[PDB]
Design a protein around this ligand. Structure first.
Ligand SMILES: [Zn+2]
Ligand SMILES: [Zn+2]
Ligand SMILES: [Zn+2]
Ligand SMILES: [Zn+2]
Lengths: 130, 130
RNA sequence: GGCAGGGAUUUUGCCCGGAG
RNA sequence: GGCAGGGAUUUUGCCCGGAG
């Protein structure tokens, strides 16, 4: 197993530095306690325009072992949706050009308006509570 | 002299608390050193919609003596322009409905895009450099 | 994303889900 | 307001003025 499916949240991200880390809470579908850190480089972020991540945002991804540690290959939001980033987007896909009613993609589960988590909604967001 | 003209910047403002203080740098036109604190209540701010002030924003106002100290009566930006506040507006008047080209008001001097100071421009803003 | 209203010294509380 | 590109552990640098 060289290519593995990961899911967690953004641990931290330095936008100027172009990198950060992900806190991997589930590896290959199985839950992780304590979470394991996975490196992210801006170039591997599925986003429209300028790439970045925001601390705590929900990510799903694929990763591999590297000489420096664990390296993510492609980083998306839950369900392959675009990431949020830092410094108005479709409720279904995160796309900037349109709204959920005009979305060409298959319907996706409701994601937290703040962090994109599929587990809660904005009104009960732990990240927002900061 | 009951009713006085003052000018300075906002010292601090607590939006939930509905009040703050102004750091008056010029009383009745004459320069003050050290500056003197003047109380502001949200109800006295010349603004469209939700009233607040942001630390350091340029402010022009009228004040009076009160049992508790100095109390501002009406608070505007330099030249009677709307205040900025906290949490798009015309470059000439601070109005939300339009842009400088369509402004019906007489031309006002250029104000810092960040703090509304008439003395500098955003690219050299001390407040922004924080 | 939306909505506001604790008057005397320090940086804001609340509400939102198959749709803006 | 605008523009981006420092690959391995911590939250971003730059540029903008009689006009968006
Ligand atoms: Zn969409
Ligand atoms: Zn959330
Ligand atoms: Zn105007
Ligand atoms: Zn300024």
């Amino acid at each position: 197993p060289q290519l593995l499916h990961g899911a967690g949240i953004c641990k931290w991200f330095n936008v100027r530095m172009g990198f950060g880390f992900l806190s991997m809470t589930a590896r290959a579908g199985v839950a992780l306690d304590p979470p394991v850190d996975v490196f992210v480089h801006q170039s591997k972020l599925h986003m429209e325009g300028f790439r970045s991540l925001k601390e705590g945002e929900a990510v799903e991804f694929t990763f591999k072992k590297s000489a420096k540690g664990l390296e993510s290959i492609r980083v998306t939001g839950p369900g392959g949706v675009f990431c949020i980033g830092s410094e108005d987007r479709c409720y279904n896909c995160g796309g900037l050009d349109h709204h959920a009613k005009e979305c060409k993609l298959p319907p996706q589960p409701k994601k937290c308006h703040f962090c994109q988590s599929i587990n809660h909604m904005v009104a009960s967001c732990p990240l927002k509570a900061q």
